[PDB]
Design a protein around this ligand. Structure first.
Ligand SMILES: Nc1ccn([C@@H]2O[C@H](COP(=O)(O)O)[C@@H](O)[C@H]2O)c(=O)n1
Length: 299
């Protein structure tokens, strides 16, 4: 489930966002969408904590001990919510100015970034062969995501600037979260709540500083459609399910498992629906398989 959700959210997210940024007459403030995403994720996470603790009194006691009585954990997790506030805003900026396939292949540089961050920040080591597999994975997903190519003004350079910022943000903020997540036995859903609390503040502050003037003229939810809420819904689910993947595996295995899932789900749709694929995909898929194999060997 957690990988099938992740992919059908991976596929639909960048396409739906790209669409909402290029077809609109009345155009929404994307800083707001990023803020609303943190709110929704906070709310699902609060829901999930009540299920896990399994009681109103245990739920309340957990928020007391782990939010109200853990200010240093909030302080720490404000850093990656600051970085994710930039990352997530950069994604919206990139897809406003670039083709979705051109966004997809470029954003895959997060994979080497994330590996280097893991090695540096989590006190971990990757063999010569494990490093080889990471670059092969990156080259494989590059080929998997490659495809042919608005009535709005566009700035490809600005689009590529934003992907460079988001790639750096992805490696750093993801690995910072994992470090904090795996440093104690504290619940995943506490960590998410601790984080999304600051996320709501930082994201809302960014909205005010970027688009505050024009929002006072036009309104917070100006330009919002059924498709803008779909993008927010997908970002929220993808965000939460990214955190679960980090809990049960890690930020490096997130790349291999996401790559594997896109390959297998596309292969499933070839056989079930007669979906047509490229030669690039077929080769990309084979390198994703080999990379997973190589990565998983004894050192
Ligand atoms: N604990 C976490 C970790 C990541 N996330 C979200 O997951 C996404 C991470 O995407 P990448 O894997 O591309 O860095 C971001 O949208 C980030 O806000 C989250 O919502 N909660």
């Amino acid at each position: 489930y957690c990988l099938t959700v992740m992919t059908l959210v991976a596929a639909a997210y960048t396409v739906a966002l790209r669409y909402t940024r290029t077809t609109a007459e009345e155009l929404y403030f994307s800083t707001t969408a990023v803020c609303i995403t943190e709110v929704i994720k906070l709310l699902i996470s609060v829901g999930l904590l009540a299920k896990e603790t399994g009681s109103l009194g245990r739920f309340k006691a957990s928020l007391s001990e782990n939010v109200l009585g853990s200010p240093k954990e909030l302080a720490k997790l404000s850093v990656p919510s600051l970085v994710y506030a930039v990352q997530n805003n950069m994604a919206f900026l990139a897809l406003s100015n670039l083709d979705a396939a051109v966004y997809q292949v470029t954003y895959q540089l997060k994979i080497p970034c994330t590996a280097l961050c893991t090695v540096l920040m989590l006190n971990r080591t990757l063999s010569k062969l494990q490093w080889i597999s990471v670059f092969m994975l990156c080259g494989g997903v590059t080929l998997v995501q490659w495809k042919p190519a608005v009535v709005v003004a566009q700035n490809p350079l600005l689009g590529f600037g934003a992907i460079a910022i988001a790639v750096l943000c992805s490696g750093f903020a993801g690995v910072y979260f994992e470090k904090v997540l795996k440093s104690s036995d504290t619940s995943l859903w506490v960590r998410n709540i601790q984080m999304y609390l600051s996320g709501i503040v930082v994201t809302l502050a960014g909205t005010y500083l970027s688009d505050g003037a024009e929002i006072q003229e036009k309104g917070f939810f100006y330009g919002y459609t059924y498709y803008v809420w779909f993008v927010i819904f997908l970002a929220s689910v993808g965000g939460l399910y990214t955190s679960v993947v980090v809990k049960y595996t890690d930020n490096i295995m997130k790349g291999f498992s996401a790559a594997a899932a896109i390959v297998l789900s596309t292969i499933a749709s070839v056989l079930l629906f007669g979906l047509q694929i490229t030669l690039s995909f077929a080769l990309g898929a084979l390198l994703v398989c080999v990379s997973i194999y190589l990565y998983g060997l004894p050192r």
